[PDB]
């Protein structure tokens, strides 16, 4: 069972395993599933990277996260024996909540059970309380890997702070460097990588990575991000990633 599907019943039991994994396996590849984009900001913006935060702010504050996948690796790119990925399935009502129909249609095809989410999902406030003291956030030595994670980290900050996103992009990143001191966006690193273009699935065919788990789900996508980072780091970055050039930069934001 490489990917463990976490519900409200086994969240506390699976947090005990996570709290011991992070000590040895400090690289966290992650991905989230969210119901899409339904809102656009009003006004004129001085930059395209400022409109992207206000568009990000407009939607994270209104919609809620559906899934989160966490994959743990070490500096050598190796996985814990047994389970390396955890898929956290949060509470979501398809009648009382706001969503984009094209996103719900595209998530239903992947295999997301929206009736289980409504009845047996996790509360994000209880998950954030458990995640605050686990050692996965706010702790030195933990490196976070991601792929086009503007929306993914906005939803994480939304539940970790239990409030709306900061009105300014400067304050969003100030609180981002506190919970996640090190962030590697694989899509941002691909700009310096020759011939690497496309989405997660498109780019994990130039690197020749075979996916484990169902597509377009947080657990399997986060696992694919982890193999993408360590393979791309091996060919293009010579097994070393500059922290002064690539750490903390999210794709589109900035």
């Amino acid at each position: 069972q490489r990917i463990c599907e976490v519900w409200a019943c086994n969240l506390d039991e699976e947090m005990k395993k996570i709290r011991q994994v992070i000590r040895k396996y400090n690289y966290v590849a992650m991905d989230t599933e969210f119901p899409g984009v339904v809102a656009r900001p009003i006004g004129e913006f001085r930059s395209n990277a400022d409109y992207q935060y206000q568009l990000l702010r407009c939607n994270v504050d209104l919609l809620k996260i559906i899934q989160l996948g966490l994959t743990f690796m070490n500096e050598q790119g190796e996985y814990p024996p047994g389970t390396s990925t955890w898929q956290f399935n949060f509470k979501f009502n398809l009648t009382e909540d706001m969503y984009a129909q094209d996103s719900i249609e595209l998530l239903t095809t992947s295999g997301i059970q929206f009736k289980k989410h409504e009845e047996e999902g996790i509360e994000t406030q209880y998950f954030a309380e458990l995640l605050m003291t686990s050692g996965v956030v706010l702790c030195e030595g933990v490196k976070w890997l991601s792929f086009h994670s503007g929306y993914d980290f906005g939803y994480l900050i939304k539940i970790l702070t239990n409030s709306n996103l900061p009105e300014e992009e400067l304050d969003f990143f100030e609180i981002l460097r506190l919970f996640f001191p090190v962030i590697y966006d694989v899509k941002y690193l691909m700009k310096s990588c020759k011939n690497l273009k496309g989405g997660l699935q498109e780019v994990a065919e130039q690197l020749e990575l075979e996916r484990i788990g169902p597509q377009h789900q947080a657990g399997s996508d986060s696992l694919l991000t982890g193999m993408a980072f360590f393979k791309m780091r091996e060919m293009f970055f010579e097994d070393h990633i500059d922290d002064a050039k690539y750490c903390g930069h999210l794709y589109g934001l900035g």
Binding site: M132, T133, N162
Partner: protein, 225 residues
């Protein structure tokens, strides 16, 4: 023993004016081998009995800028807290109950105020409150004042400010305790003061049903004795 009298001399005359000078005095006097003894001396002999000089020593740690020494101090703080928690909770040990308050105040300043968490594997605060409730009334005298001193430093943290999900996790457990008709008034008044310190309203908190789940209070991991 001559070096022992010089570590006590450094901390005896510490102040905001000579803090930078005395940080250098420690470095040229105490070597790396004797560093674990200094962390033990600072927590046991200074932090535990001197609540007024806590920002002085917290600023000393920042000025010293030694991450290895900061982990020794944090590990020694947890070691000393757990010695008091797993002890004989007599009703006349007024001094042992004051040591836990001073160590709790110190712990929050070096973890919460520095935007650092109190790790679950190091000290599980929420289950400490639930375990003390079911153990008895003397265990609540040790834990509620100790927890209230730890959460005082949450207001000075942009991460652990009251809107934090983890801070209201603890504050909602204390709201359940405040609703108990058996909790003594001296402990009810301490929870009310903590709410005023965090600029919170005790009436606006959301107490759950954590204290009525007897099947969950039976398999609690034991941090007290």
């Amino acid at each position: 023993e001559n070096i022992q009298e010089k570590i006590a001399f450094i901390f005896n005359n510490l102040s905001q004016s000579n803090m930078t000078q005395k940080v250098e005095e420690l470095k040229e006097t105490v070597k790396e081998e004797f560093m674990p003894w200094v962390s033990q001396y600072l927590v046991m002999k200074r932090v535990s009995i001197e609540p007024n000089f806590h920002s002085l020593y917290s600023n000393f740690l920042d000025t010293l800028k030694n991450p290895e020494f900061n982990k020794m101090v944090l590990n020694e703080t947890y070691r000393n807290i757990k010695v008091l928690l797993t002890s004989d909770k007599a009703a006349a040990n007024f001094s042992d109950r004051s040591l836990l308050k001073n160590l709790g105040h110190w712990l929050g300043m070096i973890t919460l105020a520095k935007n650092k968490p109190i790790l679950h594997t190091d000290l599980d605060v929420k289950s400490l409150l639930l375990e003390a409730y079911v153990k008895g009334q003397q265990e609540l005298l040790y834990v509620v004042p100790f927890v209230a001193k730890v959460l005082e430093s949450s207001i000075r943290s942009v991460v652990f400010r009251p809107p934090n999900p983890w801070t209201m996790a603890i504050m909602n457990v204390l709201a359940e305790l405040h609703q108990e008709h058996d909790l003594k008034l001296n402990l009810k008044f301490e929870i009310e003061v903590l709410c005023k310190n965090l600029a919170l309203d005790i009436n606006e908190l959301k107490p759950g049903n954590l204290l009525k789940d007897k099947d969950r209070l039976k398999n609690l991991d034991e941090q007290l004795s």
